[PDB]
Design a protein around this ligand. Structure first.
Ligand code: HEM
Length: 154
């Protein structure tokens, strides 16, 4: 797939708002993911034991992880499709070390879209959401292709 420049613009416009508070958005997204799809929490040996949303909010390690994730994703989105170098180490660790199925990347995509919709309604109307969904589908398609090359296609 290929986004137009006008689609990238909508994506990078709402992303600039996210970057005003990366740690806060990171928290909201992971809590939404773990509440919505509790099976995903099992993949994290560091967080596995967290029982409630209160415990999740209070975890400093969870917050650092959310910042790690959104910083890597932001660097990919700012490439506007030219993200082959960035995807390689990402696909290799998630396929081979962490073992993260594509299905779970769809779950976190859903969480990202939920949280931008809550926090940024004015910059996240229907067209901006369509563009962000396109940018994440592109991300997933290219990651899935890399999984397949790496021997996982999970
Ligand atoms: C927007 C999608 C995602 C991005 C950009 C991303 C990014 C990262 C980055 C940069 C790291 C640290 C370095 C590395 O190990 O590669 C990491 C580690 C990790 N990721 Fe992700 N990730 C994503 C989605 C997921 C999802 C959906 C899961 C599981 C349900 C997952 C599970 C893990 C695990 C288990 C680790 C190791 C954490 C630790 O150090 O204990 N990732 N991820």
């Amino acid at each position: 797939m290929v986004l137009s420049e006008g689609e990238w613009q909508l994506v990078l416009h709402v992303w600039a708002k996210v970057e005003a508070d990366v740690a806060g958005h990171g928290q909201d997204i992971f809590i939404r993911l773990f509440k919505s799809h509790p099976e995903t929490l099992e993949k994290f040996d560091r967080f596995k034991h967290l029982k409630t949303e209160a415990e999740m909010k209070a975890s400093e390690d969870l917050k650092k992880q959310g910042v790690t994730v959104l910083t890597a994703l932001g660097a990919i989105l700012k490439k506007k499709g030219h993200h082959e170098a960035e995807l390689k180490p990402l696909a290799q660790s998630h396929a081979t070390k962490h073992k993260i199925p594509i299905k779970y990347l769809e779950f976190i995509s859903e969480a990202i879209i939920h949280v931008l919709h809550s926090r940024h309604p004015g910059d996240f109307g229907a067209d901006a959401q369509g563009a962000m969904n396109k940018a994440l589908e592109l991300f997933r398609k290219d990651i899935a292709a890399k999984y397949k090359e790496l021997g996982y296609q999970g």
